[PDB]
Structure 1
């Protein structure tokens, strides 16, 4: 995963952002992207190769892994990172557009319409963070148990399947939840600093 281009754009957003916004971006880079690439990806590397079911039925392990893990937590976190970054890019684009328009007018910061877009950016960021949190909760909860009981065809009756690294995965699930909640708190602080 090469996050270079998103990083380069979000550092530009850092130049035009509030101090709390700069904190939020630093959290995104260090506690989400960096952890994901240095720690979590490895943890989940053997998610299917080390997933085992007590059965001689061909195809059962495939369908049972798929049912247990419709989307890997790491993929979900990648999507979450991209969506919570997107409004920042929208605001930065509006910034660059107004700067280029100003340069043109000359040939021939946060107030006004730019402040309205900034605050909308903070709102959409908040809603997307909340949505991904709640989706993670309703899909997986905040804990991975070692045992998964599977009755999906072709599996005969109910089969016992065993997860790879349930405890380490639970640790990182809770870590990422905490980081997301810290991000929400930062957004709320941005909207209370702007309000005040």
Structure 2
């Protein structure tokens, strides 16, 4: 039975916000890592092996596929998850080490509202900023639909060449799904901030 020194750590860190701010923030565990690990990875399996362009010329397929996709979507969502997860991790590390230093303190000098809310709201605004920045980068690069026919105009390919993607509809549905989950996570992060700021 060694689940006590960790039970108090979570009750101290979860005492700030509303309980709805924690019991609705499980979508980072059930809707993000699970969906990226299980289903949507296999849809991007045969990416380059099924891309085909209508040309006799050798080597045009590689440069046209490069111009179509600067960076595939699954690595993009992995970078989004990594760059969003980090402030919560450093916040938990700082809070746990401050708690451990004070737990060492009262047994080393007492044998005879603070900066935590500031760090908390800093982490929340950083999460919001990174989420809206990644959403704007995706809206600028790709849009939220994929056409089955792409027109390629790159060297050393002759004038205009047509290329056909692999499985566009399923990728469209999954792009829309990740967009909806990201927007819901954004609104959920701003709602608890409004709740805490109107509590004080």
Change (3 A) 1:15 1:153: farther
Q: Superposition RMSD on alpha carbons, in Å?
A: 1.7
Runs of 4+ with >3 A deviation: 12-15
Question: Deviation digits for residues 43-95 of structure 1, max 9, x if unmatched?
Answer: 11111111111112211111111111111010000000011111111211111
| Unmatched segments (≥5 aa) in structure 2 | 1-8
Change (3 A) 1:80 1:20: farther
Greater fraction helix? 1
Q: In the alignment, is residue 36 of structure 1 matched against residue 36 of structure 2? A: yes
Structure 1 partner of 2:114: 112
Q: Secondary structure at the match of 1:107?
A: coil
Change (3 A) 1:187 1:161: same
Structure 1 partner of 2:80: 80
Of structures 1 and 2, the larger Rg is shown by 2
Structure 2 partner of 1:168: 170
| Unmatched segments (≥5 aa) in structure 1 | 1-11
Q: TM-score scaled to structure 1, two decimals?
A: 0.87
Query: CA offset at residue 159 of structure 1?
Result: 0.7
Structure 2 partner of 1:90: 90
Q: In the alignment, is residue 154 of structure 1 matched against residue 180 of structure 2? A: no
Structure 2 partner of 1:56: 56
Query: CA offset at residue 13 of structure 1?
Result: 7.2
